[PDB]
Amino acid sequence: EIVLTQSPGTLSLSPGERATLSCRASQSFDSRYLGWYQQKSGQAPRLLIYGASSRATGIPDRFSGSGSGTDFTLTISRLEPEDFAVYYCQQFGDSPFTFGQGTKLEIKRTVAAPSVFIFPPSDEQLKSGTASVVCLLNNFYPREAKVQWKVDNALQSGNSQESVTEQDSKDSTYSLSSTLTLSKADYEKHKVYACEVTHQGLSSPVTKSFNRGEC
Amino acid sequence: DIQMTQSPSSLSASVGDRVSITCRASQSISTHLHWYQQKPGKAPKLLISAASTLQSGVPSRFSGSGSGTDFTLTITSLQPEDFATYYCQQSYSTPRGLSFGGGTKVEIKRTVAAPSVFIFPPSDEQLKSGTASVVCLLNNFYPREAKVQWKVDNALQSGNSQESVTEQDSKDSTYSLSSTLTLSKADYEKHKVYACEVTHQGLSSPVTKSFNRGEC
Amino acid sequence: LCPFDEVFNATRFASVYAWNRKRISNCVADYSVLYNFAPFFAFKCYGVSPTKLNDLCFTNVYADSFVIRGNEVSQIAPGQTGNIADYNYKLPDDFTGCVIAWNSNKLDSKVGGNYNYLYRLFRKSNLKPFERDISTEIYQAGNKPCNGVAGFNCYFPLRSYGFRPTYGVGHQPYRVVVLSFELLHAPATVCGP
Amino acid sequence: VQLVESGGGLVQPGGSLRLSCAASEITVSSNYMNWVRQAPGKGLEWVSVVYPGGSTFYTDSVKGRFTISRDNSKNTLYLQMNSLRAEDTAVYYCARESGGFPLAEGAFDIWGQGTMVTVSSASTKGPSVFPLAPSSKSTSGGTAALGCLVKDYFPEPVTVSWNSGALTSGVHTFPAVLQSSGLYSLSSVVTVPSSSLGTQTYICNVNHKPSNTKVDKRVEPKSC
Amino acid sequence: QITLKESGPTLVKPTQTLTLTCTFSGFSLSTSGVGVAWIRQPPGKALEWLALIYWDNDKRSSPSLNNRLTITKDTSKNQVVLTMTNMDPEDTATYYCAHFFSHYDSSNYYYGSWFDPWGQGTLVTVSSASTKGPSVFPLAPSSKSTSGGTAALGCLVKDYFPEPVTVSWNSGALTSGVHTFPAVLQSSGLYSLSSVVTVPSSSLGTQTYICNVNHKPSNTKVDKRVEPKSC
Ligand SMILES: *[C@@H]1O[C@H](CO)[C@@H](O)[C@H](O)[C@H]1NC(C)=O
């Protein structure tokens, strides 16, 4: 089975500069069997280039494709802000027909410090029998940020979940939510609840704590 | 009229290294490409068929890939018995155009060793018969490629040299090369200084082995 | 008037080893449609002439249709040798009539290969002219009997063409129609306007 | 499955020859049977093919002078050669095409051992032996080379041994080279320690089979 | 311009069989080179081609999914029916049906092929669970006076199935600083998410915040108010 590997995994650039995507095939097939598809956020994929060098109808002339042997590349020049999406390389050489793992095109901007706030469980969740504390990172860049739960300064793991919001439309930032879920005995057997944020935007890792007994 | 080119012509590697050989056609031949293995003195053996299909009784280390104009033969665990020659053969051309490639030779890799270079002048017994043979001998050089020249009194002779090389040895894995010049009586009674010039990678400087007929 | 459209304008042709044959009689046989057809990679005629067959009457018209490779199109001719001529479709040396072949890469080629067209590679003897051999029996290529087991020198005698759209012109699929005209002593029926 | 080739040998230019291939476990008249030639030191070259039904095909260089036939009585393959020339000097293999358990078309799964066909008018003779003494050197690192040159002979094979085959340290032989006269040359050499040039006696034995020339010569050094 | 709409049961239980129907307009499954391809994209993962049917009934399927895949065509009604059997609870994805075509020019040269415009996309989830109305918990801000004049609050929605839940703030009046995180599948096979809006600290006492969540499968509308609390 032909395996397609794309590069880079993520490509962060601002509008105006040049964008290049590479797709390498595990085997060698005719260049007319490879195509590039674009898929926006919350949309469906659409044909961008077929035959590795033929632009689809309606595709702006900024998109170009060239490749041979086991290496192909897609080149964009005037990537305007609406041109930020996920691009897939697909092959038609051997069954089954396969797509690449995709390359996300992110917007380059200044490094931002994540505002990290807390939300403890309410009284309704205090009588629900299962508690959850949620700490939030807002308006940061890049998306890469490590969260750490601490129950009385204990390294929690496996009992918490994470959800990262996609890049914002206006400020081009991110939002992350860490939710630590515990049973009532586990919630009530300890005092200090804290989360830790590690990010490039922060000079040093930042801890933040609160106490259920005090507040 | 489809011609297949194999790369590289020669490829030296040790045991255990992954080895790749490429066969490229002058035009697309779909997957009508086959890979054969031949050891010296024996018949070729079919390894890979349809450019991807392993034959029966062949170790799985041999693998074929590619299509169209480019095909690759790959060995993962290169055993000591797999240092044979490999050929790519196409079965695309219809009437009589079934042709083989030039053949890629795979052979062991060892440390570079400098040769020992000697000169053998013709003998009086051979001299009585009106024929002269002048030999220069290279013993235990590596790698195989080397340059030999025949300076007859500082004259760069050419066109009258016959060169032979030994097969790769099983003990020290080196090579031996013999360069011979055939000459008549005037050719050997006109000059004074004979020398063979050796240029080899394992030699720090080019080496001259010379002698004089009159003295010896 | 029974035209040649129902055979030429066919959605799917037949494999060469099982070539289709249609009889035609009691009609008016025009041939302007043949000229009006595809770029016609090959249109050759033995015995009859392109401007002559429109006039003289024939008792019967036999139309044999199949799909082959572009390399073997030249093999559909009297007195020719090859795999297709020997074991798939043999034209007699006395053949009167003629051959049309045209490229059909659009229809008979699919991505990943179109394995619906087969040819016979193994056969003990040469086919007689206009013979058919549609049997699929394991070919015994050695002394050891097969007994229906396709193991070692015991092979299925039918192999599929690749027929991929990116193939070269030599291996691209070509549709071939062969017309044999019969003008026996029986009164003729098929003639042009 | 065994394919045994026979009928190789040497012939004068313009002569004829017949090569046979006896097959076992496979029927010759039921398989695509090919003749493939390989020049000495060169690559493979397809020569001829015969179909199971009887059709025969030949390469351009051999059309008009080669014929390929089968024989269902003895289950053999036959290659008749006429108007031979020096380009025909090669080892010939009779092979089965489009076989193997996966049944790959156009591939030679089963090969014969091959027989050598030589086309020359050298008028087979015997070899000349010329000694090659070690140089007039004292030690040179305790390494001296000596040998015996076998020249002006035809055809191949030929055998050369040292001390009646009792010497193997530093022994090297070189493949024969076809000169312009149609004869052959080579040298058999040995690397011996410098101190061994004085007492022990060294000889070289050369055996040429068609002339049946068995010559044992002596190698001694000389002073300048 | 051609269109493709996928319909059918968007929810299928484990080891059951789903039947997705693609109705396509603007082209007919009787032309040369026309095909219909079913592809699936798992949430957060790359695309995966499933099957492809042609005009002449020829069909290709993924070898790893050949056993439990069956795709059929109805040319008169312009429909493609895809049947998938023995569904595991990882097969949750979004399925698209797409038009397939190639490009030749007067000589049958095949300058490539492609997947002509895709369908809208149908979300299919597999779970051996039952529908459950959502619950809303008010994530109230901490007791902070100024802290730079910026705080956040919101609502955490739990215990809903399946996706999605429509979240609005102040009946859509307030939209700035709103982050609605995507749904997360817990280890219990249950869904949850959080919607948080950032507001200046001075606005805590002079503004009321109401979050409304609508759940169509359970037909549940929950409006919850979030207010700051002190220690
Ligand atoms: C039928 O054949 C005619 C040739 O006279 C051609 O013009 C037409 O396109 C064909 N139609 C179909 C549906 O094949």
Author numbering:
A (entry chain L): 1 to 215
B (entry chain N): 1 to 216
C (entry chain A): 351 to 543
D (entry chain M): 2 to 225
E (entry chain H): 1 to 231
Task: Give the original sentences from the paper that presented this experimental model.
Omicron variant is characterized by significant mutation in its spike (S) protein, which is a major target of vaccines. In particular, the receptor-binding domain (RBD) of the spike protein has undergone more than 15 amino acid substitutions, altering both the transmissibility and its recognition by the immune system. Two bnAbs, L4.65 and L5.34, showed ultrapotent neutralizing activities (IC50 ≤ 10 ng/mL) against almost all the pseudoviruses tested. L4.65 and L5.34 were mapped to RBD-5 and RBD-2, respectively, the two major antigenic sites of bnAbs elicited by ZF2001.
To explore the molecular basis of their epitopes, we next determined the cryo-EM structures of these two bnAbs in complexed with S-trimer of prototype (resolution 2.65 Å), Omicron BA.2 (resolution 2.75 Å), and BA.4/5 (resolution 2.85 Å), respectively. L5.34 and L4.65 interact with the inner and outer face of the RBD, respectively. The footprint of L5.34 locates at the typical RBD-2 site towards RBD peak, largely overlapping with the RBM, while the footprint of L4.65 is at the typical RBD-5 site beneath the mesa in the outer face of RBD. The epitopes of L5.34 harbor more mutations in Omicron BA.2 (D405N, K417N, S477N, T478K, E484A, Q493R, N501Y, and Y505H) and BA.4/5 (D405N, K417N, S477N, T478K, E484A, F486V, N501Y, and Y505H), compared with the epitopes of L4.65 (N440K and 498R) in both Omicron sub-variants. This explained the largely decreased binding affinity of L5.34, but not L4.65, to RBD of Omicron BA.2 or BA.4/5, when compared with its binding to prototype RBD. We demonstrate that the binding affinity of RBD-2-directed mAb L5.34 to RBD of Omicron BA.2 or BA.4/5 strains has a huge reduction (1–2 orders of magnitude) compared with that to prototype RBD. However, despite this reduction, the binding affinity (KD of 1.67E−10 M and 4.07E−10 M to bind BA.2 and BA.4/5, respectively) remains relatively high. The high affinity is still effective in efficiently preventing the viral infection.
